[PDB]
Amino acid sequence: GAPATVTEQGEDITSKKDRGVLKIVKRVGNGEETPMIGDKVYVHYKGKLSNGKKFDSSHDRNEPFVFSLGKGQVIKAWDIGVATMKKGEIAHLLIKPEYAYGSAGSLPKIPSNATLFFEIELLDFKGE
Ligand SMILES: COc1cc([C@@H](C(=O)N2CCCC[C@H]2C(=O)OCc2cnn(CCO)c2)C2CCCCC2)cc(OC)c1OC
């Protein structure tokens, strides 16, 4: 499935090169520009735990998910990943626990040492 394809073909977009965040572009976006730190960013996404026990979607609540890039408002993997994305881009990320909820997890929703998978669409970004 999509997670396995990322684990095999996905590009390592971490600075440390520890394969903590792997990316595949699934639909190529418009323009050359990607968002800067501090940009207000608008996305739709679907996400799941590797263990299969929890799934989440913006689409579920039908409304775009909005956050300020690079401010740690989301897990580190998103600050890294969404910064590589162009407007209109859809991407897959596979994320080791160190770039998500770590050894502590975020119980009861996320267990300790969880791997996460996301499908993300970058709708738009604006400068603060
Ligand atoms: C850990 O808590 C959460 C995790 C997540 C999901 C998640 O891990 N993320 C949500 C989308 C942004 C990336 C990442 C995250 O940073 O979640 C924490 C988060 C949720 N909202 N925000 C901004 C508001 O402070 C940050 C997670 C994906 C795996 C399947 C179960 C849920 C969604 C949540 O609310 C919808 C959430 O509760 C606040």
Side-chain angles (χ1 to χ4, degrees), residues 15 17-26 29 31 34-39 41-47 49-52:
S15 291
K17 254 50 187 171
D18 52 23
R19 304 175 53 75
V21 182
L22 305 166
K23 183 185 186 190
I24 303 190
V25 182
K26 299 299 296 189
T34 61
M36 303 290 91
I37 297 190
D39 282 349
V41 169
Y42 301 82
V43 302
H44 277 300
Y45 75 91
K46 317 196 269 176
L49 297 184
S50 51
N51 71 13

Side-chain angles (χ1 to χ4, degrees), residues 45 47 56 65 73-75 78 101 106 116 118:
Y45 75 91
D56 169 40
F65 183 93
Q73 292 172 0
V74 291
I75 57 170
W78 272 49
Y101 294 102
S106 190
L116 308 202
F118 293 86

